Amino acid sequence: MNIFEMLRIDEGLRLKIYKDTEGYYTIGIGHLLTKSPSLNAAKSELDKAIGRNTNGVITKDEAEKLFNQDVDAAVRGILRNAKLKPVYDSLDAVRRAALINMVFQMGETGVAGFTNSLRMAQQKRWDEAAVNAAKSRWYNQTPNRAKRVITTFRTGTWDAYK
Ligand SMILES: [Cl-]
Ligand SMILES: [Cl-]
């Protein structure tokens, strides 16, 4: 199992523009298109991302392409963030995946704010940090996902995804 498989489960796969839980235009595999309410803006952003006149519909391959860029972006953003890099560098690979997962979902910014958990995770005190991560809007809005991630994080295993 891996991050690709992992995130493919949390995000799903849609080929036609959709609104997420938060109500934003999105498509593919968790590829946020726009925070704006204009479906056109969304189409525009779509077209601009794909490089063609999509008319809000994409193909599997395109979705996948977005996904790769997005993952690769997440990995890179982590490595370039001073708050995060180190953390990342200390974790094993399973946990890294978890980290990546959250960055993918909430951005380098929204994640940099789990300072308290993160610093705990830095010390390797799993249970502690987990509970703390839970005391969050994140956790409250998308409990099931959040749970899969915090479990993974804490366990360093993939149990929550089988
Ligand atoms: Cl893009
Ligand atoms: Cl959820």
Side-chain angles (χ1 to χ4, degrees):
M1 151 96 48
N2 59 63
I3 181 71
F4 281 99
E5 283 168 340
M6 192 206 207
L7 285 157
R8 162 118 182 36
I9 286 151
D10 303 330
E11 298 294 7
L13 154 93
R14 312 289 298 297
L15 306 191
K16 169 55 208 220
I17 294 185
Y18 73 84
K19 281 219 225 222
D20 53 27
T21 141
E22 292 264 272
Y24 300 144
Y25 288 108
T26 304
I27 189 159
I29 301 173
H31 197 77
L32 166 64
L33 284 169
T34 175
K35 290 217 200 165
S36 126
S38 226
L39 177 86
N40 309 309
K43 289 180 171 221
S44 163
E45 293 292 313
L46 184 33
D47 285 340
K48 167 165 68 82
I50 280 324
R52 101 193 162 43
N53 267 74
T54 66
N55 189 56
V57 183
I58 65 170
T59 75
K60 201 217 185 41
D61 308 278
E62 309 161 318
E64 302 205 276
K65 182 134 206 203
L66 296 172
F67 189 35
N68 313 27
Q69 332 194 128
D70 294 340
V71 162
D72 180 34
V75 175
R76 287 156 334 129
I78 283 169
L79 315 158
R80 1 201 229 58
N81 190 304
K83 238 85 210 345
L84 308 176
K85 191 194 173 249
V87 172
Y88 181 82
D89 287 345
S90 75
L91 303 168
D92 57 277
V94 180
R95 292 184 172 85
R96 264 165 215 207
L99 191 54
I100 302 176
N101 188 311
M102 325 175 44
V103 169
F104 188 90
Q105 177 176 0
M106 72 189 87
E108 167 163 323
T109 345
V111 171
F114 284 68
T115 324
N116 296 0
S117 4
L118 288 199
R119 123 210 150 238
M120 271 169 210
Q122 231 157 339
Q123 326 184 36
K124 313 222 166 257
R125 7 143 119 29
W126 319 126
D127 305 54
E128 257 121 64
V131 154
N132 177 268
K135 296 161 101 218
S136 70
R137 168 161 212 284
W138 168 54
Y139 181 88
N140 296 103
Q141 284 310 131
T142 64
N144 301 338
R145 178 180 182 164
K147 275 167 240 179
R148 304 196 279 269
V149 192
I150 311 209
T151 286
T152 308
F153 229 128
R154 177 168 21 88
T155 62
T157 80
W158 295 108
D159 298 316
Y161 285 88
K162 290 218 238 271

